PDB file of C-alpha atoms and ligand atoms in Angstrom:
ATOM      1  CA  UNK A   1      76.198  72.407  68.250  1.00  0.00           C
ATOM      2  CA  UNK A   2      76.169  69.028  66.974  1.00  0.00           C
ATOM      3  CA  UNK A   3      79.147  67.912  69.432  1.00  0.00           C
ATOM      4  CA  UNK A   4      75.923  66.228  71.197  1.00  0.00           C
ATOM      5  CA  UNK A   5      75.321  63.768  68.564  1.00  0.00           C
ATOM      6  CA  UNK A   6      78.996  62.416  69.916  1.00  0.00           C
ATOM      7  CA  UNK A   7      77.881  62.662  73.434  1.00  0.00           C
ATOM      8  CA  UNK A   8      75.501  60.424  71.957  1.00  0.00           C
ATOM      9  CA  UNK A   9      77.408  58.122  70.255  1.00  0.00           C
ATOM     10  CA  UNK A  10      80.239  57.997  73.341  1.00  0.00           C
ATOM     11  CA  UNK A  11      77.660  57.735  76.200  1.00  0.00           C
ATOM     12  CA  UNK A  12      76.254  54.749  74.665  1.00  0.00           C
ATOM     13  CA  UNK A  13      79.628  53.038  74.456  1.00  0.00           C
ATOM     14  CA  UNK A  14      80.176  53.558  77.804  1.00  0.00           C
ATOM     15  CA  UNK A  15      76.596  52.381  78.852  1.00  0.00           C
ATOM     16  CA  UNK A  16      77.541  48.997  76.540  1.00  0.00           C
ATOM     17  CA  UNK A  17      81.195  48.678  77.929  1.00  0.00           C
ATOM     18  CA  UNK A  18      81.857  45.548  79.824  1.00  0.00           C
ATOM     19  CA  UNK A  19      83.172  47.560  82.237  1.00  0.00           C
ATOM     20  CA  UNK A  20      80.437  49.722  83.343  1.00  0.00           C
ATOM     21  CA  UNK A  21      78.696  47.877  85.743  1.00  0.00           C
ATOM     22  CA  UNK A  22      80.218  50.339  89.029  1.00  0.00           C
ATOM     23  CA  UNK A  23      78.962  53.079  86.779  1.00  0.00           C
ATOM     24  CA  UNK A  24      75.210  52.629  85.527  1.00  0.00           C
ATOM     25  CA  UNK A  25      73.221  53.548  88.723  1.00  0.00           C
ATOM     26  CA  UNK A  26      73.977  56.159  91.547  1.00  0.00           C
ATOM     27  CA  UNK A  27      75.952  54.581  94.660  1.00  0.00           C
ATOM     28  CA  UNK A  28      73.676  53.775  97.264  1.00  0.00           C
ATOM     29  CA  UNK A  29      75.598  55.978 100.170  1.00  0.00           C
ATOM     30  CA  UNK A  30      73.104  53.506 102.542  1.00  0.00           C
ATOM     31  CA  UNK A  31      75.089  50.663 101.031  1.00  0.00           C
ATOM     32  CA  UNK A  32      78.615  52.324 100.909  1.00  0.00           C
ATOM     33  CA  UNK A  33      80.130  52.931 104.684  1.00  0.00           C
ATOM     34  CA  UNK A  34      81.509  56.565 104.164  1.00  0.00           C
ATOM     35  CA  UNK A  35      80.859  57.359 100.788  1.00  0.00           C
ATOM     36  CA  UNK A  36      78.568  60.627 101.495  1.00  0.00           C
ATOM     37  CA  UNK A  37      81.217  62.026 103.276  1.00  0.00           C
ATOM     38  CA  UNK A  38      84.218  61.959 100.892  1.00  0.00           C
ATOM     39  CA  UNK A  39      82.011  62.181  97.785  1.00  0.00           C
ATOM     40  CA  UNK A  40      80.949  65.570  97.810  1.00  0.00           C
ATOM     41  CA  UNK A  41      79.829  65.571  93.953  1.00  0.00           C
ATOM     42  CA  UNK A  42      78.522  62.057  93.222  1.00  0.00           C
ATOM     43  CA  UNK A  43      77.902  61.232  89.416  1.00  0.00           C
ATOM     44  CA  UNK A  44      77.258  58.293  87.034  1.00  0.00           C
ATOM     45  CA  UNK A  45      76.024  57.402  83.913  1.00  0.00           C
ATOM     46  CA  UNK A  46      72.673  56.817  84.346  1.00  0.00           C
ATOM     47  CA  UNK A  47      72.381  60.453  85.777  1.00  0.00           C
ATOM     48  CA  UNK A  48      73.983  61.657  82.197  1.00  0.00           C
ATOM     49  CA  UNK A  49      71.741  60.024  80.147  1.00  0.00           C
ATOM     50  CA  UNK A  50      68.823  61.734  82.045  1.00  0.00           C
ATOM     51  CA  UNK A  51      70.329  65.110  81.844  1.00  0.00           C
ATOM     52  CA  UNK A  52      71.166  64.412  78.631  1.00  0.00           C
ATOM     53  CA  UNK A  53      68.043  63.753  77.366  1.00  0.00           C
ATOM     54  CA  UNK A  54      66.466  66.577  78.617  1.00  0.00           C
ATOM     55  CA  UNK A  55      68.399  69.011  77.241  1.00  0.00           C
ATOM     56  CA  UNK A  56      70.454  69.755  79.847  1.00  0.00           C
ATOM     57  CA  UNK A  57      74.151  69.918  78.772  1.00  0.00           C
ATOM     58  CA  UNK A  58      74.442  73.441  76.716  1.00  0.00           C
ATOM     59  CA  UNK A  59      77.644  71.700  75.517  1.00  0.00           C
ATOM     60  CA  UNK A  60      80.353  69.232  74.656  1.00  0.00           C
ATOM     61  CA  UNK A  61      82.205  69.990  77.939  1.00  0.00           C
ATOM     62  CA  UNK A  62      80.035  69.817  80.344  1.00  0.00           C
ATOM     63  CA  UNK A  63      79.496  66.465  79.786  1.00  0.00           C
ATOM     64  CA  UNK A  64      82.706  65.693  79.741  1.00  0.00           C
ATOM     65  CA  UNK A  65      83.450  67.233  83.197  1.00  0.00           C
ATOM     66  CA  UNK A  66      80.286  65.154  84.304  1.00  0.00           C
ATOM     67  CA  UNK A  67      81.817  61.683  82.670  1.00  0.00           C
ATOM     68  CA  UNK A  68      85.448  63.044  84.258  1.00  0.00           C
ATOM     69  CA  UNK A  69      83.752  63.266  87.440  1.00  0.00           C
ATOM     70  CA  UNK A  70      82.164  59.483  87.150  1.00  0.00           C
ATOM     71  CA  UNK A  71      86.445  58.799  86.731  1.00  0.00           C
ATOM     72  CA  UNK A  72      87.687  60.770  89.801  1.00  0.00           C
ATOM     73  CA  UNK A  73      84.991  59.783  92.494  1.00  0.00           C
ATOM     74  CA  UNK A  74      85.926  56.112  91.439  1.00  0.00           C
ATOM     75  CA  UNK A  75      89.647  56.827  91.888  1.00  0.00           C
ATOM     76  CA  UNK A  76      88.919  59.277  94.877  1.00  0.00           C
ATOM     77  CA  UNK A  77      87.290  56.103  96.943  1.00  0.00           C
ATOM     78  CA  UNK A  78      88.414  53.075  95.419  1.00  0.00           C
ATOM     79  CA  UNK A  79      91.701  51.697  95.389  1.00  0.00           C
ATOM     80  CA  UNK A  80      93.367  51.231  92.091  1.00  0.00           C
ATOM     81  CA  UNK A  81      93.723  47.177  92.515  1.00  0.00           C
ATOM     82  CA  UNK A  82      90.335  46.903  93.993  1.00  0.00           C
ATOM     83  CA  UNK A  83      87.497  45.688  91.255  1.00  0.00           C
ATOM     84  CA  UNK A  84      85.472  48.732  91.038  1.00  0.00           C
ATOM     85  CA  UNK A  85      88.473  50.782  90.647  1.00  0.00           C
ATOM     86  CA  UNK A  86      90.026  48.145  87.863  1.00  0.00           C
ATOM     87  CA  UNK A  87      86.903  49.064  86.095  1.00  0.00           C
ATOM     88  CA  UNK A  88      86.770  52.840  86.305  1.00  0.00           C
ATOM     89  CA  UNK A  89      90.376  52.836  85.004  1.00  0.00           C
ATOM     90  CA  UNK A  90      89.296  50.692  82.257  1.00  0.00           C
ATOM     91  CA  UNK A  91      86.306  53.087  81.822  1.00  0.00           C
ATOM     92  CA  UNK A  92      88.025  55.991  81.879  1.00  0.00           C
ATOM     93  CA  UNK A  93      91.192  54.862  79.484  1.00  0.00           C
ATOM     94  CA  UNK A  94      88.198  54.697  77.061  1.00  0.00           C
ATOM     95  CA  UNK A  95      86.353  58.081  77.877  1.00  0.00           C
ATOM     96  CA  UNK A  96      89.626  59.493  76.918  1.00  0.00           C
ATOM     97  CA  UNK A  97      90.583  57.793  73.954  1.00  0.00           C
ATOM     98  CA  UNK A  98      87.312  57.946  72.418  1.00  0.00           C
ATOM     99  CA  UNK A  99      86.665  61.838  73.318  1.00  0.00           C
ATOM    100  CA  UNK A 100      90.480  62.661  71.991  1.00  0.00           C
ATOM    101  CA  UNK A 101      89.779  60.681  68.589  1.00  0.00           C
ATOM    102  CA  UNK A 102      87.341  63.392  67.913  1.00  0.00           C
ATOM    103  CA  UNK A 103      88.438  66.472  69.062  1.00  0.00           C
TER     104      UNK A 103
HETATM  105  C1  LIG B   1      81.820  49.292  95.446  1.00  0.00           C
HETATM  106  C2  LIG B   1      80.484  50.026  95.225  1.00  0.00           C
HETATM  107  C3  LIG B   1      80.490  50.872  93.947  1.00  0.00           C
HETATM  108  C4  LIG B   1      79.839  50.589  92.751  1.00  0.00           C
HETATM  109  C5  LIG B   1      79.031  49.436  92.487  1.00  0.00           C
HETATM  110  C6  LIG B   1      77.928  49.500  91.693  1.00  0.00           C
HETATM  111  S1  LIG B   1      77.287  47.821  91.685  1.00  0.00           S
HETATM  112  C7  LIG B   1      78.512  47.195  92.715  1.00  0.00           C
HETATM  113  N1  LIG B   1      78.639  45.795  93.173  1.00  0.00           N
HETATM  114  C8  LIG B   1      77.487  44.958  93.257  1.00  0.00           C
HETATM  115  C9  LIG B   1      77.857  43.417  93.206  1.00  0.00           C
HETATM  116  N2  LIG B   1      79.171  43.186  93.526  1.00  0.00           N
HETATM  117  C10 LIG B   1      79.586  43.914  94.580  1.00  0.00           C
HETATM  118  C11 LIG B   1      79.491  45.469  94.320  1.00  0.00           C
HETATM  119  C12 LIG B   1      78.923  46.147  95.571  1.00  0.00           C
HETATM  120  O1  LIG B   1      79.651  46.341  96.559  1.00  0.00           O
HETATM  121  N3  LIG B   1      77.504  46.569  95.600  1.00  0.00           N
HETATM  122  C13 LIG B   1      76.967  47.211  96.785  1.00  0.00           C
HETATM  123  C14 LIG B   1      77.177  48.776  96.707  1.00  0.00           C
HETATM  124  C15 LIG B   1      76.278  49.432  95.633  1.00  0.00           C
HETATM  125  C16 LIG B   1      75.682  50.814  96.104  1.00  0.00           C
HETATM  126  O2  LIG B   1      75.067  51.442  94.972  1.00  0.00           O
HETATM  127  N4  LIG B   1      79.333  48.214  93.022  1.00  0.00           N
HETATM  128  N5  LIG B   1      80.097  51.579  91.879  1.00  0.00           N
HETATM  129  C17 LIG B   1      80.887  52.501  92.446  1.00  0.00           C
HETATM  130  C18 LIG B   1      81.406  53.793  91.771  1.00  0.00           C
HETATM  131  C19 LIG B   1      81.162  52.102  93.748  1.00  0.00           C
HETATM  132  C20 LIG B   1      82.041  52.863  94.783  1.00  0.00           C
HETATM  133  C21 LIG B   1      82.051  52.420  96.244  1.00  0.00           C
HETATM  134  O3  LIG B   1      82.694  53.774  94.442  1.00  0.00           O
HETATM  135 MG1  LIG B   2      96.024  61.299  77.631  1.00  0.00          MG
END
């Protein structure tokens, strides 16, 4: 049950990526014109690391359907060429590529 120590390991990579500045902190939906209405289930990695260090993923894949989530709100309201979406495809290139090299 151990598959934690890797969401461990991965969660800090992503917290130390270059880029994972869209991704740290919660949007601010006061800041973001429309983004509590098409972002029904808003997540990011700051939010993992608190659930995560209370205990609160019973496994591996929960967190990564909370880290996949982090991936498809940025593509849901970002466009792909815009900077915050350039990131979250970097980002999530490497949330794949490092979960796959392990399982
Ligand atoms: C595009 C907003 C965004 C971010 C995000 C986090 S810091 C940031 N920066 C700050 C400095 N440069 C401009 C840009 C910005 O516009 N900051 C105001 C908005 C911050 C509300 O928290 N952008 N991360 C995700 C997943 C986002 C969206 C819309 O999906
Ligand atoms: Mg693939």
């Amino acid at each position: 049950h151990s598959d934690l120590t890797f969401c461990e390991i991965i969660l800090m990579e992503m917290e130390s990526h270059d880029a994972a500045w869209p991704f740290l902190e919660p949007v601010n939906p006061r800041l973001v014109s429309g983004y509590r209405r098409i972002i029904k289930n808003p997540m990011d990695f700051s939010t993992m690391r608190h659930r995560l260090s209370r205990g609160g993923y019973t496994s591996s894949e929960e967190f990564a359907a909370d880290a996949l989530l982090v991936f498809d709100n940025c593509q849901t309201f970002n466009e792909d060429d815009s900077e915050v979406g350039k990131a979250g495809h970097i980002m999530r290139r490497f949330f794949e590529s490092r979960w796959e090299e392990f399982y």
